[PDB]
Structure formats: C-alpha cells, structure tokens
C-alpha cells in the first residue's frame, strides 16, 4: 500500500587529486568551523464482533 519511492538520478562527484587536496583543507576547516512494543505484543489479543471471517 505504500511504495516508499525515490527518483534520484544522482551520481557522486569524482574529485580525485587537487580537488581532494582542497578537500583536505576543507577537512582542516571543518574540524572546528520500540523494543518493548515489538518483543512481546504482536496484535493477536484482539476481540471481534459476531460477524467475523475466521477459519
């Protein structure tokens, strides 16, 4: 009922040598500048009205 879909078409930049050397300088600057409800309680302890499709 829910697709959880994403259309990105995004490819990472391949900066390698001197762009990465500037990236190292960018690292130099960038350095400073659900368990209790899932273990036991499966929904099997419900009550149903008298019309109820049950095998």
């Amino acid at each position: 009922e829910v697709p959880k879909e994403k259309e990105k078409e995004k490819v990472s930049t391949a900066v390698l040598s001197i762009t990465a050397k500037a990236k190292k300088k960018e690292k130099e600057k960038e350095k400073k500048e659900e368990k209790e409800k899932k273990k036991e309680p499966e929904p099997n302890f419900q009550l149903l009205d008298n019309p109820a499709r049950v095998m």
């Binding site: 078409e9 490819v11 930049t13 391949a14 390698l16 040598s17 001197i18 762009t19």
Partner: protein, 400 residues
C-alpha cells in the same frame, strides 16, 4: 569519399618544461581536472535531460519503418526523388528514401542500408571505414613546427616567403594577375633531405601535406603517377590547399637523363605531366609543389626553368652555430650533462648533417644506457665524442 577527420585529440602538446617539475606537474593537474570537468559536464547534460518527449520521435515513425533486418550496399546514382543504389552481389535499387534521409551524408559510392522485404534504403553508414585504395592524406598537416629545427634562418625565411605569397597577401599578385604555383626546388647534401622535410613542416603549420618519395619510374602503361598526384592536389584544393613534397623523385623520377627515346617512358610521360601540373595556366589551386633533391645536376631542363618552376632554394651544410643549435635541440630531451659539453663536439667537426646529429645523439644515450647508466652520465662528456666518431662515415678499401 573522404573530406575530414574528427580532430579531438592531441591535448595541448605545450607542456612547457617537458621535464618532471612542479610547473609541469601543475599543468598536468589542470589538464586532468579539465578532463574531469568536461566528462562531468557532458554526463550531467545527457543525464539531467532538458525534457522527456516521448520516444524522441525516433521509435514512433522512423525506427519501425527502417525495420529490424538490414543489409548494406554502396549507393550508385542520385535522381530527383528516388536514389540509385548498388547493393550487395551487384543488385541495383531505384528507391526514394524518406525515413532518416541525410542527403549530404548519403553521396555516391557510400554504404547505405536496405530494409529487406520491400527493399528500400532506410539509412546510411557515414562511418563505412573502407576508403583504402590510394591513401596519402593519412599524414596530413604534420604537427612539426618551426621550432623543431633551428640554425636554418635564411632558408626558413625564403621558404616562408615562397609559401606565404599565397594565404598571406594573396591580393598582392591577384592584382598582379599571375597566380604562380611555382613551387620550390630544393638542393642539399645527401646527408640531409628529411629536413627538406623539417623545413617543409614550417609550411605544414598551415593546411595539409602530401608526400611522394621513391614512387617508381612509372612503368605503368596508364602512367598516371603525376596525373594521380594532380587528382590528389585537386583533392587538396577541396581540402585546405596542401603542398606536395616529392623529394628524391624530382631527381630520379624526373632525371635529366640525357637519352631521348627508348627511356622507360617516364621521360615521355612523367616530365611532361610534371610541367603541365606545374604550369598555372592548366591547373588552379593554392597547391605549392616542393621539389627537393640531393642531386642538383640531374635537374631536367623543364625543371631547370624558373619560368614555370621558380623559387630555387639551396640547402647548405650547417655552420658552427647551426651545429650548436641542432645539437641543443636533440640533446634537450635527454639532459646530456650538467657540464654542458657543447662546443668541443662540433668545433673541429666538418661535413656533419642533421641525420648524423640525430644519430650521434641517439647513440650517446644508447651507449650510456648500455652499462654506463648514471642518469646524466659523467662519462657523457667524452662518450658523446666517442660515439660521434662511431666510424661509419665512409668506408672503401684503400685506393690510397
């Protein structure tokens, strides 16, 4: 069948140091970064598309009508609406193309597709990649420049003037109403001649270049040695106006052979076809024919005449400074030594030509690499002289 080739290579030969240094390093980083950015540009343009419009109108109308099965055959003739195509095993079809028609790229004698069933041309293969009957433009517009050869300043100026009378200042003698394709008759010692090529690369910096060396004493009954070169210079006029370098055939193929009749038919055909093409009254075009030789004596009287073949140029032996310059050029790539032993190898030398200079430079590196491997081998100071002797100059029993 051939017009031009895609020149998207030879990425900036001007690497200024040509030796491993920071500057050359940094130039290569800029080169590689641009390659990265160009690839990223085109990939992002092709991927982040401007618009999604159906099947790009290709599979809807043309692709299906072209069909799955196809066969290739040459296209023979053209008529106003249909086209006359000589397909495989000597089949001939008269069909009008309308799907994927590119008339300019279709052309007679080119490979086109046939959709089978209802045999109609549906496309053309502009690549084809089989124009191999006579191939002389494969080496066109050689990358060699003026700077590759030095110490020949007088000859460089003379040949440059003789070939920059066209291109540069063509109205000069257009007003003088002559349009002379005189060409240049080059002398020179047999120890040179591929410089007759090096001095030709100065003009090869502009337009293309054709070469006919050794050819034959055109025993062929059709002759058509110079006549096919006439067709190829016509092709050169279709292209950028090229020059024809016929070194060693202006000598042998056009010899002042002094017998008259019963003389291999080149004297009848080749010389007579050479002067017809060298006369501007018969063939037009900015084509300049460079007739270079090492035997000035065998100049045929038709070739002797400056009236049709003007601009006689003599190539002399290099002087002391010219020897210094050529040795500097050839040893620049190899870093001969840190002592720069330059003048000792040429001061007493005489009758040493460009081919000998290149040979001794190569052999100096070979002898150093043999066992004396020392980067800038300290032995190079005298080993350059050791391999400049190298015997091999001339040898003929004694007779003395």
């Amino acid at each position: 069948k051939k017009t031009k080739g895609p020149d998207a290579a030879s990425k900036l030969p001007l690497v200024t140091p040509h030796t491993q240094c920071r500057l050359k390093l940094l130039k290569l980083e800029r080169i590689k970064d641009y390659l990265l950015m160009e690839e990223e540009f085109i990939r992002n343009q092709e991927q982040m598309k401007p618009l999604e419009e159906k099947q790009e109108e290709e599979r809807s109308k043309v692709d299906d009508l072209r069909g799955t099965p196809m066969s290739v055959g040459t296209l023979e003739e053209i008529i106003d609406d249909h086209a006359i195509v000589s397909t495989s095993v000597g089949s001939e079809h008269y069909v009008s193309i309308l799907s994927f028609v590119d008339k300019d790229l279709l052309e007679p004698g080119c490979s086109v597709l046939l959709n089978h069933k209802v045999h109609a041309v549906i496309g053309v293969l502009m690549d084809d990649t089989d124009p191999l009957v006579t191939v002389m433009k494969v080496e066109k517009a050689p990358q060699e420049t003026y700077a590759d050869i030095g110490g020949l300043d007088n000859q460089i100026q003379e040949i440059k003037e003789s070939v920059e009378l066209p291109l540069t200042h063509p109205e000069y003698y257009e007003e003088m109403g002559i349009k002379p394709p005189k060409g240049v008759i080059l002398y020179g010692p047999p120890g040179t001649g591929k410089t007759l090529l090096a001095k030709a690369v100065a003009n090869q910096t502009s337009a293309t270049f054709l070469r006919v060396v050794g050819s034959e004493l055109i025993q062929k009954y059709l002759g058509d040695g110079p006549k096919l070169v006439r067709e190829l210079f016509r092709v050169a006029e279709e292209h950028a106006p090229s020059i024809v370098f016929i070194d060693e055939i202006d000598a042998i193929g056009t010899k002042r052979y002094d017998s008259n009749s019963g003389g291999e038919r080149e004297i009848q055909r080749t010389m007579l076809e050479l002067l017809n093409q060298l006369d501007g009254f018969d063939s037009r075009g900015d084509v300049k024919v460079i007739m270079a030789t090492n035997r000035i004596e065998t100049l045929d009287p038709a070739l002797i005449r400056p009236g049709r073949i003007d601009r006689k140029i003599e190539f002399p032996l290099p002087d002391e400074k010219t020897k210094k310059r050529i040795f500097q050029i050839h040893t620049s790539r190899m870093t001969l030594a840190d002592d720069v032993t330059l003048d000792d190898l040429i001061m007493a030398k005489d009758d040493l030509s460009g081919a000998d200079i290149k040979a001794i430079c190569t052999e100096a590196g070979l002898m150093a690499l043999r066992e004396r491997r020392m980067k800038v081998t300290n032995e190079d100071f005298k080993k350059s002289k050791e391999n400049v002797l190298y015997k091999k100059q001339e040898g003929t029993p004694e007779g003395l």
